[PDB]
Amino acid sequence: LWEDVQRTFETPWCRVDVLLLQSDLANFLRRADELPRAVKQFEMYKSLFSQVNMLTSVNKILVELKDGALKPRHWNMIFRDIGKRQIQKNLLDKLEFSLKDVMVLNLTLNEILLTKIIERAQKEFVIEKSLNRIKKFWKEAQYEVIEHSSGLKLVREWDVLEQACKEDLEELVSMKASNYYKIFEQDCLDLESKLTKLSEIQVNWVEVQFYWLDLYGILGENLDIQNFLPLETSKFKSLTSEYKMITTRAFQLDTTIEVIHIPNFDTTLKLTIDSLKMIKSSLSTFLERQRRQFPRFYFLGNDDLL
Amino acid sequence: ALHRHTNYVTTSKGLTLLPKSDIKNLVLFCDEINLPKLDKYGSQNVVLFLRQLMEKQGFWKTPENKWVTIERIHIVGACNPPTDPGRIPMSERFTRHAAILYLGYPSGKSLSQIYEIYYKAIFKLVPEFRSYTEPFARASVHLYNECKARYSTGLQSHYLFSPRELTRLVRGVYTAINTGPRQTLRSLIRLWAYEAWRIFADRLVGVKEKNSFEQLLYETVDKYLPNQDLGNISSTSLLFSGLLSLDFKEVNKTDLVNFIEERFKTFCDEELEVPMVIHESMVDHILRIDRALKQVQGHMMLIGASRTGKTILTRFVAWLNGLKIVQPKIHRHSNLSDFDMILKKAISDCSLKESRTCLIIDESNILETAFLERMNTLLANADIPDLFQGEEYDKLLNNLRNKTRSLGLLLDTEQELYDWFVGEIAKNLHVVFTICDPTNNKSSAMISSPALFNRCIINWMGDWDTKTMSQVANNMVDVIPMEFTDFIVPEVNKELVFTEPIQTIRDAVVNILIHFDRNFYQKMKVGVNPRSPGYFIDGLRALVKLVTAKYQDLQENQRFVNVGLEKLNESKSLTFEKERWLNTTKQFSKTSQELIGNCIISSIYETYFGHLNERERADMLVILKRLLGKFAVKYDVNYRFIDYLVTLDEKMKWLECGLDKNDYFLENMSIVMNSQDAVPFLLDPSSHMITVISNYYGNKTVLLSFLEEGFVKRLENAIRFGSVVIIQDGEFFDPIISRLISREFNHAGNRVTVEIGDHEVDVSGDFKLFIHSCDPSGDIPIFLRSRVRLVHFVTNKESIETRIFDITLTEENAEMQRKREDLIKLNTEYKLKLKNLEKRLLEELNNSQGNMLENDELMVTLNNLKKEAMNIEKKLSESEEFFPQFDNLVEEYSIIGKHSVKIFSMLEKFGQF
Numbered sequence A: 001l002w003e004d005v006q007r008t009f010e011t012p013w014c015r016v017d018v019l020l021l022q023s024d025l026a027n028f029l030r031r032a033d034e035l036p037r038a039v040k041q042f043e044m045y046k047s048l049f050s051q052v053n054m055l056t057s058v059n060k061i062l063v064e065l066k067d068g069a070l071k072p073r074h075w076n077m078i079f080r081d082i083g084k085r086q087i088q089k090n091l092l093d094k095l096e097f098s099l100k101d102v103m104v105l106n107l108t109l110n111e112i113l114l115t116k117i118i119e120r121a122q123k124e125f126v127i128e129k130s131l132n133r134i135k136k137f138w139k140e141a142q143y144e145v146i147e148h149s150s151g152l153k154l155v156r157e158w159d160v161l162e163q164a165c166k167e168d169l170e171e172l173v174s175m176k177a178s179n180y181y182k183i184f185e186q187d188c189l190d191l192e193s194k195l196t197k198l199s200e201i202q203v204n205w206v207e208v209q210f211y212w213l214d215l216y217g218i219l220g221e222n223l224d225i226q227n228f229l230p231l232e233t234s235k236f237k238s239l240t241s242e243y244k245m246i247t248t249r250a251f252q253l254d255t256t257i258e259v260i261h262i263p264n265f266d267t268t269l270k271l272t273i274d275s276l277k278m279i280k281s282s283l284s285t286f287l288e289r290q291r292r293q294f295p296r297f298y299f300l301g302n303d304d305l306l
Numbered sequence B: 001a002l003h004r005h006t007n008y009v010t011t012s013k014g015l016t017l018l019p020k021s022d023i024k025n026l027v028l029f030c031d032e033i034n035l036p037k038l039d040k041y042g043s044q045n046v047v048l049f050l051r052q053l054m055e056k057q058g059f060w061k062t063p064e065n066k067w068v069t070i071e072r073i074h075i076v077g078a079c080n081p082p083t084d085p086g087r088i089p090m091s092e093r094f095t096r097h098a099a100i101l102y103l104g105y106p107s108g109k110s111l112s113q114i115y116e117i118y119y120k121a122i123f124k125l126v127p128e129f130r131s132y133t134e135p136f137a138r139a140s141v142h143l144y145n146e147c148k149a150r151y152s153t154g155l156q157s158h159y160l161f162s163p164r165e166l167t168r169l170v171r172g173v174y175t176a177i178n179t180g181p182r183q184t185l186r187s188l189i190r191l192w193a194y195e196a197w198r199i200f201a202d203r204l205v206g207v208k209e210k211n212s213f214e215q216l217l218y219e220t221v222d223k224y225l226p227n228q229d230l231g232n233i234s235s236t237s238l239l240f241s242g243l244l245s246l247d248f249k250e251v252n253k254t255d256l257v258n259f260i261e262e263r264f265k266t267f268c269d270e271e272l273e274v275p276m277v278i279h280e281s282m283v284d285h286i287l288r289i290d291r292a293l294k295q296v297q298g299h300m301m302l303i304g305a306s307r308t309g310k311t312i313l314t315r316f317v318a319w320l321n322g323l324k325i326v327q328p329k330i331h332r333h334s335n336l337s338d339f340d341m342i343l344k345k346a347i348s349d350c351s352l353k354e355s356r357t358c359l360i361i362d363e364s365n366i367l368e369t370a371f372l373e374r375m376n377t378l379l380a381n382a383d384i385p386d387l388f389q390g391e392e393y394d395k396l397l398n399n400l401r402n403k404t405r406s407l408g409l410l411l412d413t414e415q416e417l418y419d420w421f422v423g424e425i426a427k428n429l430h431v432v433f434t435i436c437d438p439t440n441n442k443s444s445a446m447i448s449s450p451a452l453f454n455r456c457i458i459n460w461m462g463d464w465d466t467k468t469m470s471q472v473a474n475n476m477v478d479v480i481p482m483e484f485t486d487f488i489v490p491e492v493n494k495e496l497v498f499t500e501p502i503q504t505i506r507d508a509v510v511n512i513l514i515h516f517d518r519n520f521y522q523k524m525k526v527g528v529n530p531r532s533p534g535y536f537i538d539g540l541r542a543l544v545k546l547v548t549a550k551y552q553d554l555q556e557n558q559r560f561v562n563v564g565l566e567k568l569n570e571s572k573s574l575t576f577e578k579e580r581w582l583n584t585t586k587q588f589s590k591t592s593q594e595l596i597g598n599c600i601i602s603s604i605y606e607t608y609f610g611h612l613n614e615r616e617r618a619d620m621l622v623i624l625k626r627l628l629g630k631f632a633v634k635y636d637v638n639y640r641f642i643d644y645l646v647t648l649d650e651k652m653k654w655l656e657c658g659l660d661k662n663d664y665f666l667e668n669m670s671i672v673m674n675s676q677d678a679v680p681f682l683l684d685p686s687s688h689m690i691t692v693i694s695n696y697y698g699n700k701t702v703l704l705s706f707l708e709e710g711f712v713k714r715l716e717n718a719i720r721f722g723s724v725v726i727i728q729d730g731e732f733f734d735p736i737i738s739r740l741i742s743r744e745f746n747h748a749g750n751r752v753t754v755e756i757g758d759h760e761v762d763v764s765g766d767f768k769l770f771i772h773s774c775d776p777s778g779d780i781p782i783f784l785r786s787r788v789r790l791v792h793f794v795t796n797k798e799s800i801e802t803r804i805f806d807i808t809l810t811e812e813n814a815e816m817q818r819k820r821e822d823l824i825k826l827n828t829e830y831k832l833k834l835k836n837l838e839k840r841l842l843e844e845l846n847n848s849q850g851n852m853l854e855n856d857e858l859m860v861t862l863n864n865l866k867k868e869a870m871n872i873e874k875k876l877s878e879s880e881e882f883f884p885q886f887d888n889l890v891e892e893y894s895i896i897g898k899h900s901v902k903i904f905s906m907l908e909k910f911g912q913f
């Protein structure tokens, strides 16, 4: 029994399970008495029973420190302020310390400071859970692609991701109010920066795609209108070519967020939307110039007049 | 409804028919055929559809526009007489095609035989009293007759009796005899009386009609069952329950109460935590709800008042019987599809898994009439055909076919499977409606609905009576110490006392609280009182916390004065006169006697007067003072709420943040800030408070509203990271914040979690919630209004009444006005600075243990303190004459203000025109 209990004391804390620990402690209690008096008189049985009673004395503490909220920083703080010793970093960062250390911390007496540090652990995990959820959502998000008559690729359902980005940005802003935000600041700031860049790119992209669809009906299809406005359609063809290259390289990434790393993307979309707006203004001026020559065209509109 | 039994077919000359699915003819029983409402142009379309089905023998498909000829389907409708309330007259174009048959009540004498047969049936379990089959039945019938004549619809709209009540009584008598112990004649009479109480007298309103029913029961028993060994047949005198024993026997009250308490403690511990007090009415209603939930189609409708305990009592009784409590998590933007999905999930759990759910439907858990119609269809039948139709039906029949196989019973026919499904829903699903005020349109529609009123057991909780309030108060004022007031038993009328005869200060406290609650509801509320005490409970809790805090303060001050006196007695020429100025040990004896009175006044002011005018507050405070004087509890004669509760630092902070200089606004802010056991609901037309609160909390303030779409998410952020939340609108309210309005959380190891919608969010602990409203005309849901601390920040007309005074006295008695403010100002700054100088003197004595040159500063400050002592004494002596003159001078300008307010009212009427 001594070998078994010594083995179970040496298991790494990252692999200890309390459900089997309860049964193992029950077996240890059952088999403590059946040992002969030779073991009883020696320190072996006394030490074994004392350690088993130490394990059975505290069981809420073990399950509380088994929670996912505990982190290597909290273990370091517990060891330094309660155990008065330093743990090897390889032994600590992987939570592979043995149960003998947990015995050493003397959970029976220091349980007040233990719960004091565990409360901080759960609140820091409240912050970390939101950060991890945001990161996981934005590591798997992707647009929905369709292809119209031309070779261009079109995005559908802008809202399902725009609203998610806006809500995540609001969440990252609201995290600064929490007192336990200081340790998570260095990651939240970078995530907020990336999401702000993605939001700006999204804002430009939706307008670019909408304006290109609106203008493709007018120019690029009807040869007559392009003949009346050669400069506008000449610019529009180059805009469509550049937008096609940009969108192909963008959807060759499989993730929406990584477009922030594309060289010259946001400025390219700004230039594209500016040129599309100038072409739209040119169409408006041309239509008004046509209407001021035969004013009855004011009873028709734009599509009929075109 | 027809989709289950009919099968569309097609033929060249037979363009789609809708005949029977089987070979038997089909009979459509449309109950309450004249009930459906009619359009604004005066035509109800369902009746016209029925006429189309009976005259043209067909109809038109609305998607496809094809003539569907019904084949061998018959129409049989049932309707109450059109003179009954809510019965819309039917057009003669429809009833022209139907043969009308009138079916009256079975003559009142045939009922005797009809139910004597039932009693002969149910006495096969108890043959020893076979000869008693005939009496009981007659008695039952007689009882019904009397309850039909005494309690008419003229008293209450839900006093509708019928032989269905007699059948319920017979089933109850059987199901108590069947599972009960060996019976004796007295036991059978008491059992029948208990069932009669539960059937006929549960719905009764007011103690007058309950006493009338009790004397009717006594007369009936003495007339038809002239037994000579019986006890009291009152509702609380007899208690039948199977919670204690394995039988169903009349249990002793003390054992029942002890068991209920030891189970309620466990329920509050392991289930959601709400500190609650057990009393006799709670035990009685627990028995009632247990009896309702125990039977097969046991549905209950609890009509009481808000904060009575109906919802948590239902949850407790369901937990006792192992019923899964399901509550619709709906909110403002929840449409009929969400309710349909919730009902579908509840039904699937009830039948496909045998979950034995208990669906608690609040009055506010229904938004439009579609929800109520779904409840009608679920209750009248044991299923809602609209949920399971078309392809969803095909899945259901599949899930049935597998499931029914797992129980070891073979059923391959679709009809058999659906009949088993209906039976499982009927014996597994219990619906417990809870409605706060029955005069509301939604709740009146719920009560008057035929399916609910005919299937549900109307249990009328009503509002708390004086006995329940006394019990709750006694169990709630028994935690705070009252061994310092030196109470003397006062001479009061027997009607004034409510608890056991007054022998200690605690009984005086509970009597004062009950009397003030009654007087307050008598003045504010008119007619019937559909409001249950939530002010009473909040006031009790506030009084507990305030007595604790004030006694701690008094202990600290007494300790400081005593240690100073010990230091002075240890101490060279003038300290003998500080021995005189430390006569405050005598003042402490007087100020400790008034601690309970001041705490009662302050707690009542915090709870009740949040939503009152400047004049109503004064009148009710006068009433409370005369109530304290009626009993033998003392209080500070010159008591001011601002001075007593809020300190100088907090008042200066509020004034700096942007609060006005009004005493009314200072009291309102004290109510808002000091009382944070319940959410505050700030009502003000101008939004000037929204900035003020923000100025109090700097950058932590977060502004939301119930109208914006992302609100549900935004709060879930503010609730998780600890930022003060102000919700700009309060007249609207989506019940998802319900679990936040009442502090009903899910605790854990060290994380507190609250359910919003269907997400569990962790509460930081630094998170505050203020609800804010703009228009005082707007209403708030009864769930919100009774849970929230409503604070009125409006500037009413009565604000003129005082304000002109502050002008008149400014320009009529300048010196008197000057002395008025500086009297209290110097008084307060004296109470602070004399303590400051006393601790200065004490620490100097600490630093002057054995020195001699340092004693000069001690002597000069000793001579100094005499000056403020003289100023304090002079101010007290001058106030002793100033206050009588001030109160004498108040009445003249009160006469001025009486006309001023009338003039302003007339002006505002002019402006309203």
Ligand SMILES: Nc1ncnc2c1ncn2[C@@H]1O[C@H](COP(=O)(O)OP(=O)(O)O)[C@@H](O)[C@H]1O
Pocket (backbone or CB within 6 Å): B274, B275, B276, B277, B278, B279, B282, B305, B306, B307, B308, B309, B310, B311, B312, B313, B434, B472, B537, B742
């Ligand atoms: N016996 C009691 N002791 C203490 N508080 C009670 C008692 N009965 C009711 N209450 C108060 O009334 C409220 C009733 O809660 P609940 O039943 O959920 O709402 P409702 O009564 O409106 O259905 C509780 O919050 C509780 O504070």
